[PDB]
């Protein structure tokens, strides 16, 4: 009745992207055919394709194939895909070096033994190279090694890189909707989805809203190609970093930076700058900036600090791209110039101008401030007047701290062993808070989503709902979310501030009852054990607190989503509650959390830091 792991979901990606006019002006006549071709295979054919499309781009064996859930005999199926131009079979596998890599370790030794010439034992690389030398010098023993190694490897397929790229692009276009822009996504793999959203796309029921694009994100067919190209170039650098191939990373990024310097000034790359920030992230320029941002992360890892500093500054000197990141760029720059390069004058310039940037928010803001008080009080600095410098006294108030310690044996303790967060909950349960939610951000986030649902999904803001499978308006993570909905927000926000506990209980029930399960990026439906609990909690928190938290979340979700209190405990009978920031044995309070706790206290909530120490 539906289609497999990969396929029902793939079919959504296809359906969604095809019904999008602007998206379909980005594919030539030929390419669109490749879609109609796909739609015209057997389900079995579609299923096998999806399965393989998701795999690495290389030769894959028929023995290493065995998709029995697809068919008991895959050869009529593979046949169908080859005839359709989607797949290629081994009668086009001619590179001996490829065929050698394709064999197993039992199979290599079979080719190694039945070629007495080769010394039978060794690692895969040791045998492959021996075979490769032997065929270069003597081509007419070479084609004999191929003829046997091919037979021994059996039937084999590889994806036609032609149509692959069409779907890859279709799938990249699908990432604008949904996937990416709750701050820009992983991008890693150069072919497939991220794990979060293949498996579950077909099950998912989305919140209702009115689609209404009016701007063209991509100019002509080639823009999208430059975009795609860039995205992949990013993915690889991400990938290289993940595996600690920093030198590899450095090359890829150096490579990219050159590709970018070549690329600006072009006919297209003005335009994109003048896109609203919430669409500007889907631009070649944005991607490169992200790459360059990673480039600094790399150079830093490779102790190449003057390079990082030159980069950071050049990134900051521009305003168009990734403003949401300057807080980091500044912070990180100050860190370098101080810790590593040990250069005072520029360390202060940095901290000064960084604070003069309205763009640096919350935690990095607070960070730079602290780096400034430490610098002003500093004796090694005192030969001057350089930071008494009219600094709005943004206190880092130490809030109530608490420490705990349990009979230590993953760090497990004795109370019977128990976790670090079990210890923390336990502590509060015996301080008279029977209830508790070990959320970490989402508790609050979902409450806000619950209380502002209709405002979030609101009609009227153009270009924020561009197609079918969106869990948020595209502008949610941008200063513009608030501004574009100002009247409506201020309204509800005040309403909530002056609401009696029953109205809160009501409005939360209202949404819950109308939406329970629709995919909305802010709301975790199972985060509360039931509406009742969610209601109990809003009743403790009360209007003003909920109002405040909501406002920050709406006004600056980008720089406020993080840092919210880890754990929320409360008393069932007395309605007293406490917002706690749990700290395991080997981590500290982030600046973001310091900020959030302070903010919450300003709002009149009981807050607390909790340290758990080793036994």
Swiss-Prot record:
GO terms for cellular component: cilium; cytosol; intercellular bridge; nucleoplasm; nucleus. GO terms for biological process: DNA repair; double-strand break repair via homologous recombination; interstrand cross-link repair; nucleotide-excision repair. Its main location: nucleus. Residues 293-318 form a coiled coil. Mn(2+) 1 binds at residues 566, 581-582. Residues 501-613 form the VRR-NUC domain. This is Fanconi-associated nuclease 1. Its cofactor is Mn(2+); Mg(2+). It comes from Homo sapiens (Human).
